[PDB]
Structure formats: structure tokens, C-alpha cells
């Protein structure tokens, strides 16, 4: 056992690992989205940039949670990073929608983590959920793209790319 | 009675107070509008900013009129600030229209104040109506949004947000 | 229902709204105080400034809680902002005392909000109570003004105005 | 009773005081360590500096908790600061080990404080445990010094002094 | 079929995808190594940094090859990113050795890609193998750590961490 | 015995230790005073600052005397730091008076140390009493606060706080 471990639950340890995998997965999703929009037959440079940045942000979450497991005296175990549910993301609107679904799910996993912490009386971990959320952020992007007429309007997706994401 | 009072009418004093309440009310209207457009299902960031600024401007009017009442030797009395006539402002165009109606009304109250001053031979107060008006300003915004096709066109409200209000 | 809502309680939604009204009310109280002290027969410029700043601070709280309701997928509903309990605040000491009573009350409402969050297992909201309190701050001002001899000593209120609030 | 007190428990008040004494004690431990290593027959300048800094950090914790007790309307009561468990700290490795034991103990006292807060529904205090911990930090130093061959290797303690602590 | 495709082989397309997966995998290996050395019971900060940088470098390769597939008119298909062959990397020397084995393997896959290009007369792809290799770089690190006495000498791994990787 | 010891008396060694404890004690007294005046029902910010600085100064003396014991080849032994004679310091004037009594006592202990040095023909130690005294400094503060009417005059303590200590 670790010298620096103290009131860290064996189930807390496993919960952390699951989230790490979870956050790496979201990073892969956003990576896959980004290069979809880099395609010569999709060609939305700012979507591509936008999701490429969100890919970095989630990999950074995984690293924070890795920096957790280690700080708390636990042991990092890494699983396969499963490939995303799509190769073709169809439209900017569709990816924005998929990303909204993904983040709500990731958030739900964090709420569970936070509950487990509370019930194991682990206040340092409940705080390590040091988030600030982009759920509204994609929320907003989805609303706008719909009102502009996406995805049937190809003008809509093109402009939003220049004006909101530019 | 006040040492610094001089040719300030008891009806002038009450008229000022009514306007103060009036100007605070307009500030609340613009506050309520601003956060309507901050909604994830409305998502017009620049409307939101625009009305949030107009909220500050009207609260500032109220403070000028408060700084009046006091300067002139009168006594500030504050009423309830009644909540706006809507929670849902429907569209950017609709708020712009509502705001136009509101400002014309507030202006009408100022003209009455100015008349009362003139008939009480109160030249310092008639001047304290030191305005410069945004009635045309919303006038212009309304015209444009209509010609673009609001509110049926969701593209129209989105672009105007970026281009005129940006 | 909202796309960005998730584990936000309908009673959480109403609780937020009550606080918003509550925080706007405190802003109105401090506004009313400020211009009391701007009176030619009270004439404490730094009290006036001091409470005018606290008015801004509370309106800013209301806006943060508005920025909440919206982020969480809830719906802002605004009530009347009821006028303060006084027009005449009597003395600097008396306003400082009234303000202390007001802030303790507002704080009590926040503790209730925080409890409700905890019992609805709403960790994002319990944190949104991102305060740092001025209860001691008026606490200190009250102690000093009393020891100087307020409000019977008119010298006391005048000096404190220059020295602590200057 | 205090004007600025509100939902602060009499047992919360005593718990704070115990921690204050606790944190001052850790400061004395690190002070005693620092000047051990300043000895002409120990002569590890960077250990000496390192623990002298940690002495400042803990005295600073005590002051934060003092600034608590006062803010919350409670009353500071100070006990004797008991002298450390050693005059001779033996080796750099041994002090690092002792310090690890000390910090885990101090941390355990904080977890208890945090629990008490939670059970007294005192959210402002549970947060005032605004830490970020050096338990891993000495954890790391201990691991390295062991692998280098401390304390039998006098070369090891000398180099680590220059290279990790320099 | 794509408008911008020209002399890009369907087997060239699949070969690219395999390499992308390959390069992402190496990134995961270096990520897993980095946080191994961030452990309180391993505690080699500069190994940790070193492999964390190499993680970034390989993810960057994957992105270049993604930027390929797309440029050439092909279609990106992403597989699972399989978790590394170890959780415990044992020593700095052992990871350096594992990383050497990994890079030789990745290099072998690139030589095959380059051969396939040549035999499909695909000169733009044979060039896209725009590398400059760190095989010698870990080669050198391995030689030094061995000569210092790794991994039995814990002094050796500690110093190399400060002196070569610092 | 120490290699760097020379004409340092075993009674000189014990005398130093007593002073170290003595100087740490004065630091604790000034710490306890400082946070007394930080109380919401005392609220003299500049007293609080003033004594907090004097706390730092005395802890610094202790460290100089520690840096002595070590330089001279002696051995530091630390006792309990006994808690001050008061929790409630009553008034600014009263603390200033208590502090004057404390410093005269600490000074008397230094004169004894200096005598012992002289009689043991220890000129390096008699010099290490490298002081410059604040006995007059509190002397002056006491005189002023009395003439202003402390502690019955609460105006007096408040002004002196702003004007002499500001
Ligand atoms: Mg995330
Ligand atoms: Mg107006
Ligand atoms: Mg507030
Ligand atoms: Mg501590
Ligand atoms: Mg590579
Ligand atoms: Mg002294």
C-alpha cells in the first residue's frame, strides 16, 4: 500500500479510472469530428478548429484525473479507448448535437462520481470535479444552427462557421 | 423645510419621483430582455449584451434624477419596481418593438414633466431633461429586422445579431 | 423541456428565482441608502459612495444567479422589486445596522438554498453559492461607529466618513 | 453573543481552535527541523531552507484559521505550542519521513473538521478547508532519498540537497 | 468518389489508416509511461515530462497522417486505441527500452508504407514519411542509463533524470 | 563535542536557549494581540497590522539566536511555547501597555545574557545582543493614547489607529 494514501476508497480508485477512460474517449470523439470537417467535401474550417480544440480540452481533463489518481495514492489503470460511434458526422448541426449528447453523458458520470465521493466522505475528491461545463455552449450552437435552417440550408452551416465559430 | 430649496414645486417633487420609478422600471425591462436572449434556446449573445447595456443606461437616468431631487432640496420617495409585462420576449424583433413602445411612453412622461416645469416657471428642471434619446436607435433596428424577414426568418435574427449589434 | 437541463430540480429552479429577487432587493436597499446620504441635510459623501458601490455588488449577484438559471436549463421569472423599509435612514450608524440585518437575512436565504441543493444532490448549484460575504465588514463598521459615539456624536459620523470610508 | 455570528456551531468554534494549535505546532516542527540541518555537523543548506519555508506555510495556515474564527463570530483561544518530538532529526530522510507522518495526521484532523462541518450543515466552513496538500510532495522526496541509498549513503543526502531541493 | 482524389491507391488509403492508429497507440504508450513516473513511489519528474512530450509528438504524427488521408481524397477510419502492454513500467531504463522497441516497430510499419507507395508509384505519399526519428535519441538514453548502473542503482536513475533530462 | 566550538560556555549555551524560547513567546503574544484587534467587535485594523508585524520581528529574533547556537557549536533545545496571559486584550491602550511590560522583561533577560557573556569573557556573544529596541516605541504609543483619553474615549483609540498607526 501507498505511503501518501489516506481516506481514498478502493471504489473511488476504480471510479476515477472509469472517468479517465471516459474523458479520453470524448477527446477521440472530438478528434474524429474535427477531421471530418477538414474533408474537401465538407470543408468547414472553423468547425474543424472548434472540435480540435475541444479534443485538447478533454485530453487535458483525463490528465487532471490522472494527476489525481496519482496524488491520492491510487493506481492508474488504462483501458482501450473505443473508437467513436460514427465515421461520417453528416453535418455541423449533427456533430454539435452528438457532442451535446456526449457531454451530458460524461456529466452524468461525473455526478455519479461526486455522489460516491460524498457517500464515502471523501471531500478532496468532491471538488476535484473542478469543472465549468460546455453543455450550454453546444446548447447555444445547436439552437442557432437550427434557427438558421440546418442542415438542409447549406448557406446556414457555412455562415455560422464564419460568424459564430470564426 | 430644506435650506437649499428654492422655487421647486411640491408637484415638481412628486413628478420627479414618478420619473425615477419610471426610469428604474425601464432598466428592469431591459434586464429581463437581456437574460431572455442569454437563454440556451434563444442564444443571441449580442442582443443580450445590447439590452444589458441599455439596462445600465436607464438605471443611470434614475440616478441622475435622484441626484436632482436631492440637489433641488426635495425628498426622494421610492415605490415598488413592478416586474415587466413579459417573461418570454419571443424574438429579437419583438423585444426591439416592445422597447420602442416602452421608450416612447417614457418619453411621453418626460414631455409632461417638462411642461409642468414650464408652467411652474422652473427653468433649472426644464433642462434637467438633458436627454438625447434612443427612440430612433430602436426605430432603426426594428426597420432592419423587418426587412430581413424577422421573426419568421431565423437566419435574419442571427445575422443582424452579428452584423448590426456586434 | 430544455436540451441543456440535467439534474436541476423544479424546486431548485424556484429557489434560484427567489434569491434573484432577494439580491435585487438588497441592491435597491443600498441604492436608497446611498442617496439618503447624498442629501444636503445629511451630507456624508463617503457613506453615499460606499452604499452606492454595495448596490452595484448586489445587482451583480442577481446577474450571476440569472446567469445560473439560464446555464442550468431553468427559466427566469422576475417578481416586483419591493421598495425598502425606510425612506429616512436616520444616521450612518443606523443604515450600517440595517444593512447588517439585511445581509444576515440574505445569507440565511442562501444557506437554505445550499441545503436544498445538498438534499437534491445538486453539487453544481452548491458551489454557485460562490460568496465571500461582507457580514463582518459591516460588523466592523458598526463596532467603530458605536465606540466613537454614534449617532449622538455628529463629529463621530463625520470623521468615520473621512477616515474609514475615504 | 456576536452580531456577525450565524449558523456557527459552538463545537465548530472549538474544532477551529484545535486546528489552529495543530497548524502552529506543525510550523514549530518545521522550524526545529530547519535549524537542525543548519548545524555545522549536519550542513544541508537546502533542507534547512526547505523546512524553513514549510514553517512559514503552516504558520500562514494558522493565521487563515484565525482569520476564520474571527470572521465567523467565534472567539480565538490559544493553547501552549508543544515542543516537537525530537531535537535530533538524524537525517534528511528521517525528517522527510517524520514530516510525512505529521502531515497525514494534520490532514486527518482536517477531514474530521470537514465532517463535523457537513453534519452541522455549515457549508462556509466546509470550503475553508481550502487546501492543496504537500503530502505527495514529501511522498516524492522520501521515495527518491530511499532509492539513492539514504541514510547510509552520505553522498545521496548531499546530492539530493543540491539537485531536488536546490 | 472524391473530386480531389488522383493516383491514391485503395490500399494506400488503408495503409494510412493503420499508421494513424499506430501513431495514436504510441501516444497512449508515452502517456501511460509519463504518469507512471509521476507516481509518489517512482517520483522521476523529468522522465514524466519527457514521455509526456513524446506523447504530444506522436499524437501530432497521427494528425499529420489524418491531414494526409483528407488531402489525398481518402477517408479516415479510426479503430480502437488499444491500451499499452504494461501498467507498471518498472524503471526509467525499462520504459526507455520499451519505447525503443516501440519506435523500431512503428518505424518498420513506416518503411512498409514507403515501399507500398513506391510500388504504387505514389511519390506524394513517399515523402509524407517526413520524419526525422528519435530512435537514436532513446538509443542514447538507454546506453547512458546502463553504464550508470540502472536499474539496480537508484542513484543512477535519479541523477540521469536531473542531468540528461533536466 | 563540536569541531567549530571554542570558548562557548555550557551556561552560555543554556542561556541562549532560554532567550530563544523567550523571543518565540513574545512573538506568540503579539500574534494573539493582532487577531484580538481583528475581531468584528474590536475592529482596529491598524493595531492588528501593527502587532502582526511585531510578531514577525520577534520570531526573527528567535531565528537569529537559533542561527547563533548553531554558529557557536552549541545545540538548540526548544521548550513549549506557553500561551499568552490573556485572550482578551481589552483595549489598544491595554495591549500597548502589556507589550511594554513584556519588552522590558525580555530586555531584562538580554541584559542578564550580556552580563553572563562578559563574565565568561565571551566577546562574540556580547554583540550578538545586536538589538535597537522598541521599548521607547511603545512608550510613545502609550503616552499618546493616554493623553487622547483612552480607553474610556472610543474616539481616541479609533483615531490613533488611523493617524499614528496608519
Ligand atoms: Mg470533460
Ligand atoms: Mg430613459
Ligand atoms: Mg448578496
Ligand atoms: Mg497545514
Ligand atoms: Mg512516430
Ligand atoms: Mg525581542
Author numbering:
A (entry chain A), B (entry chain A), C (entry chain A), D (entry chain A), E (entry chain A), F (entry chain A): 5 to 170
Quote the authors verbatim.
To this end, we made a mutant named Δ3C, where two cysteine residues (Cys90 and Cys102) related to the formation of the intra-subunit S–S and another free cysteine (Cys130) were replaced by alanine (Ala), respectively. Analytical ultracentrifugation showed that the larger protein assembly in solution sedimented as a single discrete species with s20,w = 17.28 S, which is very similar to that of wild-type (wt) HuHF (s20,w = 18.8 S), suggesting that it is also a 24-mer protein assembly, so it is referred to as 24-merΔ3C. To obtain detailed structural information on 24-merΔ3C, we tried to crystallize this protein and eventually obtained qualified crystals suitable for X-ray diffraction. We solved the crystal structure at resolution of 3.104 Å. We found that 24-merΔ3C is composed of 24 subunits assembling into a ferritin-like nanocage, approving the above hypothesis that the deletion of the intra-subunit S–S bond of NF-8 leads to such conversion. NF-8 has the C4 symmetry, while 24-merΔ3C has an octahedral symmetry, so this fabricated 24-mer protein has the three C4, four C3, and six C2 rotation axes. The second difference in structure between NF-8 and 24-merΔ3C is that NF-8 is a heteropolymeric protein containing equal numbers of Hα and Hβ subunits, while 24-merΔ3C is a homopolymer which consists of 24 identical subunits. Notably, the structure of 24-merΔ3C subunit differs strikingly from that of Hα and Hβ subunits, and thus it is named as Hγ which also forms a four-α-helix bundle just like the subunit of native HuHF as shown in Fig. 3a. However, the superposition of Hγ and native HuHF subunits revealed that a shortage of an inherent α-helix in the middle of the D-helix is lost in the Hγ subunit. Consistent with this structural difference, we found that the stability of 24-merΔ3C is lower than that of wt ferritin, namely, 24-merΔ3C can dissociate into subunits at pH 3.0, while wt HuHF disassembly requires at least pH 2.025.
